Every structure is written in C-alpha cells, then in structure tokens.
Amino acid sequence: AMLSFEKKYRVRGGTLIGGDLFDFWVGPFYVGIFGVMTVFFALIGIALIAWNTALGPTWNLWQISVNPPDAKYGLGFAPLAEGGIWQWVSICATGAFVTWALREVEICRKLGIGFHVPFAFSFAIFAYVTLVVIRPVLMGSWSYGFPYGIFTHLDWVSNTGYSYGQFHYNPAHMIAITFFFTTCLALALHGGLVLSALNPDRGEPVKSPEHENTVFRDLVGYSIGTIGIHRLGLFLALSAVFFSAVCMIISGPVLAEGGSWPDWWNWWRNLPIWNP
Amino acid sequence: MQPGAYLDLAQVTLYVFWIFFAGLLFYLRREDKREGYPLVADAGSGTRLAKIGVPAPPDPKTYLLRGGATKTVPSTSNDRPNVALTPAAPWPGAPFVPTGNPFADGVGPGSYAQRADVPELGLDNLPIIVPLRAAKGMFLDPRDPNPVGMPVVGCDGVVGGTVTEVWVDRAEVLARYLEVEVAKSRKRVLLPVPFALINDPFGKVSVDAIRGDQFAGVPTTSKGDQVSKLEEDKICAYYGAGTLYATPLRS
Amino acid sequence: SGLSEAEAKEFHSIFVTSFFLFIVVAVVAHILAWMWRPWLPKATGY
Amino acid sequence: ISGLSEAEAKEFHSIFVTSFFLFIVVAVVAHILAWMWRPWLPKATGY
Amino acid sequence: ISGLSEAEAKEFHSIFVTSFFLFIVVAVVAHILAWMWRPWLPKATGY
Amino acid sequence: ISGLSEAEAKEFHSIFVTSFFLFIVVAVVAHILAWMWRPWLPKATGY
Amino acid sequence: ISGLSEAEAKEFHSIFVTSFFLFIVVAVVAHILAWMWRPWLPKATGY
Amino acid sequence: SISGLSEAEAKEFHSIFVTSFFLFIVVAVVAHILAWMWRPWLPKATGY
Amino acid sequence: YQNIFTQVQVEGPAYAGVPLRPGSSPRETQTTFNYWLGKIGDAQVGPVYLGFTGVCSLLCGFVAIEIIGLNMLASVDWSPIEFLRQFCWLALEPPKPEYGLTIPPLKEGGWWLMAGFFLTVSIALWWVRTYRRSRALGMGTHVSWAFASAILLYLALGFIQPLLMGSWSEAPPFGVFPHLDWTNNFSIKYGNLYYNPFHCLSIAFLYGSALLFAMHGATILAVSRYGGEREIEQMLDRGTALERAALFWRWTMGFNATAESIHRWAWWFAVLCPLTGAIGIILTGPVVDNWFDWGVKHG
Amino acid sequence: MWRIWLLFDPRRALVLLFVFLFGLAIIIHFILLSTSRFNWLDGPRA
Amino acid sequence: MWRIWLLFDPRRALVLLFVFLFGLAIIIHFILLSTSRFNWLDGPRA
Amino acid sequence: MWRIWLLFDPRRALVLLFVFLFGLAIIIHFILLSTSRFNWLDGPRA
Amino acid sequence: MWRIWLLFDPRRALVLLFVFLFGLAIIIHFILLSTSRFNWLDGPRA
Amino acid sequence: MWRIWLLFDPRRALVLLFVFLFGLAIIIHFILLSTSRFNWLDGPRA
Amino acid sequence: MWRIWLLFDPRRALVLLFVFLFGLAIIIHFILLSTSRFNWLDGPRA
C-alpha cells in the first residue's frame, strides 16, 4: 500500500541498472536491482552465520561468533571451516552495504533529492572496511579483523585497545570521542528545541524559528539556524566516524602493535622548552 | 532476589528497561503515523477497510497558531490524492507513468503538496520571504557575488532570462529566491537558490534542472512582493521535475 | 569562493617575490650554520 | 581586501617600520649584553 | 578607525605615556630592591 | 564618551580615589600585622 | 541617574550602611567567640 | 528597580514575611537547644 | 550544488529576539555578526541574555575551576613552565579512601570536595537557567530535560555511586589524562565494563544518536532545495519536502517519521544514552562488583 | 526594612529563599550524618 | 558615598552581594571543617 | 586622571575591578595556605 | 608615536594591555616562587 | 605602501603579530631557563 | 600571471602557511637542540 500522499511520487524511471525490470515496490520497500542484490547478500551472510553456529558449540545469541582466520593464513583465503566463513560473511556484508547505498542512490534519483544520505552512509561503510579489510591488510593477516559476535567483537575491541597500552591516549581516538559526544549533545539540543517550539507551554501557540534562534543563542552563545544545525550535525557525525577510522589505521600499521599510546605523548614532555 | 539466587537486581533492572523501551518504541512508531494515514491500498487489494498498521495512528493532533488559529494534523487536504498518472502495469507495486506533462501535472520529482495559499507570517505578522526592495535594512553583503544583473541561462546553454531581484527570508537572513525577468515576454518568475549555481562561472548564473525556454513555464506568484506556501511548493516542484523529465537533449 | 582577479594576480606577484627572498635568507643562514657545524657525515663519522 | 584604504596604509606601514626597527635595535643590544653574560655556540670540544 | 578625533587622541596618548613611565619607574625601584634582596645572573659556576 | 558627564566624572573619580586609598591603608596595616606574625623574604640560607 | 532617583539613593544608602554595620558587628562578635574557642595564627613552631 | 506595588503589598507582605521568618527562627532555636542537650559541639583543642 | 555552504549571504539589522514575559531583566546588546558563522550557519553572535541564574552559574563554575587550577599549580610547585609541561597529566585527585564520606583535609581531598560541590551548584544553576529561558519564551522544556540526563550521569559518576560505595575516593579526578585513567581503572576494577548491560545500552544509544543525526542532517540537506529545513512550518503545513523525506525513508527501510516525530526519536536516543549510562554506573559496585562474572552467570 | 520589597520581587525572592533554605538544610544534615559524633542513625563508629 | 547608587542598580548589586557573601561563608566554613584544629564536629583527628 | 572615566563606564570598570581584586586576594590566600610557614590554620608542619 | 589610537579602540586596547600585564606579572612571580633561591615564602630548599 | 595591510586589517594583523611575538619570547626564555648554563635563577646545576 | 587563488581566500591560506612555516622552524630548532653535536646551548653532552 501507499501513504495517503505517496501516489504522486511512485513514478517510473531513475534507476541505474536493469531498466524497469526491478523498478517496483514490495509493500513499503522499493526494490530496484540493488534491493534484490542486498537481500541476496544479507541472506547468504545470515545463512553462513547460522551454518558457522551449527558447526559451533552453542546457539546462545550472545556467544555466537564467526571468527577470522588464524594468523598462519596471512592475507590469503582460509579453508571454510578454519576462518573462510568469516571472509565470506565479510564479502557478503560489504556487498550488502554497498548495494544498500546504491539502492538509496536510486531512491534519491527517483524522488529528485540530493545524495547526502548515501554519501553519509558511505562513511560508516568506510569505517567497517577499515576495520575488516584495510587494517588487517596493512598488518598482514586477516586475523586482525574482528569476530562477528555480539560479545566476542567486544572482546576484540578490548584486546585491541589494551595491546597499545591504554587506547585512551590515542590522539585521533580522543578527537573521535569528542566528535561523538558533541554529536549526542547537538542531537539532544536540536530535538529538544524543535519539540519545544512545536509543543509549547500550556495555552501557548506553536512557536516560530525566531524563538528557536533566541533560545539557541541564550544557550550556546550564538545561532546557527535551521540549515546550519543539520549541516553541523552531519559534519559532527561524519567527522566522528572518519577520525575513528583514522584512529584505527594509525594503531598497528603505524604505531607498533605492542606499542604505547601513553608513552607517545612524552614527545611533548620532552621538548627542550622544559625537558632538562 | 537473594545473594545466591540466579535472579538479581541487575537483570531485573535490565528487563524493566526492555519493557520501558518496547513501550517507547511503540509510542514513537505511533507518533510517526500522524501524517500519511490511512494507507492507500493498491491494485488487487480490498478497499473496504482501512490499512493502518500495528501501531494504529493516534487521534488527530491539534496545534494552536499565533492568531488564535488552529491546525489539525494529519493535513489530509495537502495530499493531492488523484493526479495525472496511470499505472505502468496492473500488478501491485507497479510504478506510474505521467499521462500528461509532468511539469504542469506536478507528478514524480515534480510533485507538490496542496499547501495553504498564503505566505508564512513569521512573527510580526508579515511575509518572511520578500524581495529585497521590500525588506529595508538588509543588503547582499558584497563579500559574496551579486546575482542581480547576471542573465540566467538554462541547462542546454540557452539564456533563459535576467536576474532582477533577490528574495530573502526575514529573521533568518538568507537568500531564498532569485527573481528572473523571463527572456522576451516581460514576466517575472522565481528561481530557488539551491536550484541555481550563483557563482558566475563565466559571466552568469546557471540552472541545470530545466533548459532555457522552460523558464517561461515556471509557476508565477499571484502577488508581486510576497509568495505563498503553495506557490513555493509549485516553483520548487517545477524545478525538481527537471531532475527526471527535462534532460534537455544534452546528449 | 575567493576574491577578485587583479587582486589574485598581484597576490601571486607579491607571494612569489617574498617566498624567493625567504629562501635566500634561509640559504645564507645555512651557509654559516655549516660553518659552525657541518652535517651529513659519512659512515666513518664526523 | 578588507575595509580599509591606501589613505592610512601609506604611512601606517612607515610607522610600523620605525617601531619594528626600534624593536630590532634594542633586541640586538639585549643580545650583546646576553653574550657578555654568557656566550653560546660552543665548539664540539665543549666550552 | 576608532571613534576618536585628533585632540582626545593626543591627550589620551599623553596620559598613556606618562602613566606608562610612572609604572616603569616604580618597577625599576622594585627591581633595585629585589636585587638588594637577591642578585640574579650568576657566573658560569654559580653564586 | 562613556555616556557620562565631565564634572560627574570628577565626582566619581574623587570617590574612587578615596575608596582606593582607604583600601590601601587597610592593606598596609594588614601587611604590618602579617609581618609581625611571620616575616617573609628570608636570607639565602633560610630563616 | 541610571536607574534610581536621588532621594531614593540616599534612603537606600542609609539602610545599606545600617545593615552592613549590623552584619559587621555580628561577625566581629562571632570572631571574638571563635578566637576564644580556637586561636589561629600560631607561632612558627606550631601551637 | 521598583517591581511590584508600594505599601499596598510591601508592608503587609513584610508583616507576613517577618512573622514567618520569626516562627522559623524560633523552631530552629528550640531544635538547636535540643541538639546541644543531645550532643554538644565545639570541643576542646584535645577533643571531647 | 548542495547546501553544505551558503552561496550568497544577505546581511541586515541585528535581531533583538522575541520579547520575554514580565519576569526577566533586560538582556545584553552585543549583537555582532561573524562572517564564518554565517558561512556555516547564522552570523549573529548575540545578544546573550545573562540573568541571575546565569551569573551565579558562571560564578560557581569559575570558583570550581579556580580551585582545580590552583591545586594543579600547587602540585607542581607553582612553576608555570612545569605547569605547561605537565598540564594534561595534572589533576585535583579525589579524597583518599581512608576518609569515607567525611570532609577530608584540603590536600587529601578537601579541595576536591569543594570543587565538586561548586561545580555541581554551577551545573544545577545552568539547568535552572535553561528551564527559565525556555519557559520565559513560552516554549516547552525538552532541552532542560535532555540536560537533566547528562546531569544525572555526572551526579552518578561523582556523587551517587561514591555515596552508595561509602567513599569519595571512588569519584573521578579533575584532570584530562587522569580522568581518562580513572575511566580505564574503573572498567578494570569492576570486572569488564563491556559486560555491564546498561553500558551496552548506553553505547547502543550513543551510536544510534550518531547514526540518527547523520541520517537526519543528510535528509534535511537532501530536501533543503524544497524548503526542508523549515521543519516547524513543514509540520504545521506539510509541503513536498517532508513528503519526499518521509518517502525516501519509507522506500529505504519500510517506515518513516514525520517532521516532529523524528525529533522525538532524536531526543529520546540522545537522552537514553546517559540515562542508561547513569543506571549502569549506579549498579557498578553497589550491586555488581565484577561484570564479567555477571556476564558469565548469564551469557 | 519593608522597603526591600520595593526592590525584590516577592515571588522570585520567596522561591529562591525556599530552595536555598532546603539546600542548606540538606547540606548540614548530610555533613552531620557523615560524621561519627553526630550520626543519629547507628550512632558513633568503633 | 551614597552616590554609588546613582549608577549601580540596588536590585542587582544587592543580590550579587548576598550571593557572594553566602559563597564566601560556605567556602570558609568548609575550609575550617576540613582542618583538624578548627573542626567543631569530631574535632581533632587522630 | 579623572578622564579615565570619560571612556570607561564606571559600572563595567568597577565591577571587573572588584572581580579581579577578589580573585587576586583568593589566589594569594590560597598560596599562603599551601605553604607550611604561612599556613595560619593547622600551623607549620612536622 | 601617538597616531596609534586612531586605529585601536582604547576601551579595548587598554583592557587587553591590562590583562596582558597582569598575566605576565603572575607568570614571573610564579616562576620566582618555583625557584629555590628566589622563593620568598618558605625560602630555600634543602 | 604595503597592501598586506589591505588584505589584513591592522586592527587584527597587529594583535596577532603581538601575541605571536609574546609567545616566541616566552618560549625562548623558557628554553634558556631550562638549560643549566643559561639559567639566571638557580643558575648552574650540579 | 598564474592568478589562481579563487578557491582559498588568501587571508586564511596565508595565515595557515605562516603558522606552518613557524611550526616547521620550531620543529627543526628543537630537533637540533635535542642532538648532542648541534646543541648551541649547554654544549655537547659527555
């Protein structure tokens, strides 16, 4: 079915590949060629995860884990029962994410709007690819990718962080955390501001963007405006993710694996301004 | 439960949260259904009973406006339900084909909503989108280029007209529209700033959505120094139609 | 964007003529620096 | 360009040069006195 | 340009330089006292 | 021009100076008392 | 004349001085009592 | 900075405020008498 | 072209703002225009209304900051050189464990306690200021209740969990790297905070707020050519921009929000991040002392 | 002294007075309850 | 003397003065209460 | 010297002067209290 | 010489000068305080 | 005349010059004060 | 004669270039100080 206003927009055309073969909707969802491909990749991946779990000890959802290959295989294809399932789930996942971004591009073209959403999703895709492809390749073996498990990839994060002393002292990581915390702050501020203007105090009319500008001024000191806030939010989230990716690229390929991020900062303490 | 029991305060708190969060997701998904409902059933579906979904849409919400006025959402009068479209195939989910001219019909990327035919009044009960000749005290800040005077050119390289005036938003100092004296019919049409490259690439401002002659067909505003919400959607929709239906033979 | 055109051409014409003299004074500095301590030793040493 | 003209920058730059020169000369006096207190730039043997 | 004409400019500058000089001379007597309490600038081996 | 008169500035200045001066005399009594409780500025060897 | 009249100024100032003085007297009594409970300002060797 | 009426409320407001402040102070004084009968404070320099 | 920057920026008079209810004071009159601010957003830099609560909030906060800074200067023998050298490593450390919840000596956590008291009073006064600035314009208080969640996490970190543990020594220090080390040692001392479920939920809601604000910013910039950034007007009178946004998300993932309910989603994700965080912190130590053991007990 | 009510708004003065008094009472009760001599619940330590 | 009120608002200066005095009093009481000599509640430590 | 007030509005000037003087007094009291010789509370150490 | 003030606002230039001078005085005093020889409180060390 | 003042308003291209000169003088004094030879306060170590 | 500064406003680009040049000179000087052979202060170690 359609929203009460949707029929105007469900027009033909705007696809990238395939013509009108897949130019249709299934309920709410637009399909396109990339929608078929995305469901294909997602389902092959989920079935490989289920099979890897069937080979494993437990079905416990928290303990399910698809582990990367042993370091003995380096950057080569591992046997399916000794890490190859991880590589194939990774290929299926990157395929799913890419075809999902492309389906979003097709929807953008069909609606006649900008491509900001697929572009922004490409940043999360890039962070994932950094984690499972770029960083283990730079470090020489697929064993550096994280295991696909709800609580085993947390163990991977813990071990990876503690292998560099304390990961908090990673500078790009500090920048990324600052960006994430500011993104959460700005999301709360923006949501609350719009909800305050739309749902005012009792007996009050719905407030205007001028009131929003005034209260934003009184809080943050100045005003960015209705388009500035969405720009700033996009920028904050994207830069958080980009600096997370940089953070991961510089630890292991650049700073040695058994290195120390706390000790890297001694370059400042050891400046000739104050060292001797 | 007791120190040795399998049940403990942490997981009880977690299940309390799971209940609260399921309730909150239901509430949020319910708030999401204040526009666009009930659903329009497609081909091969019985239309006797309404399609709504598992969180049913809430009761219509009533907003109070400044001048004692009142707006109840959903805005069902904005839907434009029946338009100039025909199904490209009899099965459900098939796309539609514009029967006529999608620039005039307002279909596809060229669709608009039946908004109120009245301008936005902002705060001092005056239209906020006005020509600079009507908003005294504001100025284009010559730090950036000045659009006025530059003749606007289509997408196929044909000059469409000349930029005559810059329309700005009050209380949010921002240029929203360029007024364009059309080529040779003595008519002024609006051009949304995001649909124009006002940079002076060579000498002029360029719009790649429609071609040069199509500037004659841009929906004109009824007044001269104020534009209504309906005309705003109509103009932005005329320009959005070109993103799919113009492609001005530039191959 | 940026600025006007003749502005840009004079910006280049002054930018390069300051960059050149900066390199000149850097070179005359390195000369007597090397006089004080010659760098770039051989695998033998200094 | 910002919001000034050549009316001021014709000799504003002149007084800037005079002040900068007074700075440089008093600084070289300071350096001479500092060298008299302690010379720097030793030779690889030491001081 | 600041919202000041020439007359107040010069007389303000006169007050500025005179109070600046009074500040300098009291700082100088302060340094004389501080030196009498403890001289700085030792020789190459110390005090 | 500080949105303020000239003789009014005379008056405010007179009151400011007398307040400043009573402050400084209270502070001087304070420092005499503090020195009598505990002197500072020791010798190079200590107290 | 920023805000207040001239008679209200005198009246407010009178009440202000009386209240400030009463506060100071109460505080002085409090400090006499506090000293009688614990003297501060020890000798340089402690209490 | 006048704000509110003058001796149309200020005097009766001051009357009510003073009597309430006084009731508060009296209750507090009784509370402190009882607290000193329970536990004295202000010990000697060596403790209690 | 896309709306990451403004091509043509118009400039006009300074806006004094909406008149307030008869319960406030005359605001400042700075109202200056910065060019780059207008490049990325709006250009006005005022006028900041600073009333009683704002001024007392800044006074208490700067008392706390002065205490912290003077303690970091004293801990380094007042050397500004050594202060610049060691700055990120300096901190006003919390009280020692031997003192419990008493007022310890100044050099053993008394200064920390006073700085924490004054910082808490500053933050509560700033919260009251947000509440009044919203309700003095007739608006809702959603921003204030979003701020209250961050305040609840901050109180749990510095006050509530130290209370329930019976010792101020549990609380963070006032320093950059030292408070990072406190975070690390807190995770290490109480098992492994990855097995705190409310920690997992707080991370879920932080990632989700980043995801949601990327999605929403990108969506509004994508339909900004149709007037999408005027969200209040698009909610009161739905235009084609918000229709296109709703349709993008409905065709992408099967469901969409409205112009107002998307901001409810945003508010609730951003608020649930520190709410679940505060719960997970209050549970860590008074209730659960080893989170990995708890996770093994469950999964 | 009643003249103070020409300066202060009685409403906001009264709300500030109440919040202030309650905060002071809470602070003092907490300080006493954290000490050993004046803890009236479970009494002294040791 | 009394003319300090022709330019300063009593409603403003007076409330700022009261806030300042209470903050200073709290700080002093806290400093005394942290020391062992001037603690009046569990007075001397050790 | 009175002309200093012809361009400095006595309100801002005097309020920031008071803030600065109080800040300096606090800093000096804190420094003295940190030293062991001039610690008028708790006396000298050892 | 004197022409400066036509370009710099004294209301701001003088404030910045005073903040800078106070900051420099504080820095120098603290540097002396950190030394063992020029410390005038607690005097020398060891 | 030099039109770098035309690109850079001396109202800001002179306060930045001064903050930079101050930073540089501070850095050089700190460097000298950290050396054992050029320290003029507790001058030579060892 | 090259004219291309139309994307980077020469003020921002130039101030960033200058801060980079200054940072670079600082880096090189500090590296030289860190060495033993090229240390014009405190001379060569051991």
Ligand code: BCL
């Ligand atoms: C030695 C310790 C003694 C003791 C010695 C004393 C002494 C001495 C005194 C008191 C006094 C009081 N004691 Mg006692 N008291 C003790 C034990 C207690 C216990 C207890 C559970 O054991 C309680 C509840 C109390 C309570 C009280 C109050 C009746 C009174 C404090 C006045 C006040 O709060 O002003 C507050 C006044 C108001 C008007 C506040 C009004 C409420 C405002 C509006 C709150 C604002 C909103 C608020 C912040 C919202 C909170 C929401 C939260 C999020 C939940 N005492 C122990 C046994 N007690 C004092 C007294 O009697 O004064 C008359 C007093 O002098």
Ligand code: BCL
């Ligand atoms: C080794 C470190 C541990 C770890 C130890 C902790 C500890 C301890 C905590 C967290 C907390 C969090 N962790 Mg963790 N965390 C780990 C790994 C992660 C990873 C990861 C990828 O591995 C991520 C994404 C996170 C993310 C998170 C957040 C979801 C959560 C912080 C919520 C928040 O928004 O605070 C931001 C908001 C605040 C900090 C409060 C707001 C502050 C106030 C309101 C503002 C005052 C400003 C003031 C006025 C300014 C002037 C002050 C003066 C200058 C001093 N952690 C590992 C396992 N983590 C916090 C939490 O809630 O978890 C339950 C927490 O306490």
Ligand SMILES: CC[C@H]1c2cc3[nH]c4c(c3C)C(=O)[C@H](C(=O)OC)c4c3nc(cc4[nH]c(cc(n2)[C@@H]1C)c(C(C)=O)c4C)[C@@H](C)[C@@H]3CCC(=O)OC/C=C(\C)CCC[C@@H](C)CCC[C@@H](C)CCCC(C)C
């Ligand atoms: C939804 C949860 C998120 C959130 C929300 C949130 N924060 C908020 C608000 C909201 C809704 C406000 O309304 C309020 C505000 O005014 O925002 C502009 C605020 C605020 N959150 C702030 C900070 C802040 N929020 C943080 C986190 C979060 N805030 C969460 C992620 C953090 C982190 C991650 O550490 C910080 C540091 C302030 C900007 C402001 C509250 C200001 C305040 O209480 O001021 C008290 C006054 C003083 C202490 C005096 C000195 C003031 C200056 C020191 C201000 C400096 C601000 C900032 C640059 C500090 C950064 C850290 C420093 C160590 C450098």
Ligand SMILES: CCCCCCCCCCCCO[C@@H]1O[C@H](CO)[C@@H](O[C@H]2O[C@H](CO)[C@@H](O)[C@H](O)[C@H]2O)[C@H](O)[C@H]1O
């Ligand atoms: C029509 C389609 C035809 C498809 C043809 C297939 C082409 C071959 C696909 C590329 C496969 C290369 O496969 C893999 O490549 C890497 C990248 O260098 C090789 O090289 C790697 O060797 C070792 C591990 O083996 C790593 O530690 C090392 O860092 C890397 O050089 C691997 O040893 C090899 O196993």
Ligand SMILES: CCCCCCCCCCCCO[C@@H]1O[C@H](CO)[C@@H](O[C@H]2O[C@H](CO)[C@@H](O)[C@H](O)[C@H]2O)[C@H](O)[C@H]1O
């Ligand atoms: C502002 C936020 C809301 C207001 C504060 C919220 C909490 C209010 C109620 C606090 C109740 C006191 O809570 C109670 O604290 C005491 C001491 O403080 C703890 O008592 C114990 O804690 C631990 C237990 O190992 C030890 O330090 C010690 O044996 C003892 O102090 C209790 O375990 C806790 O239950």
Ligand SMILES: [Fe+3]
């Ligand atoms: Fe928004």
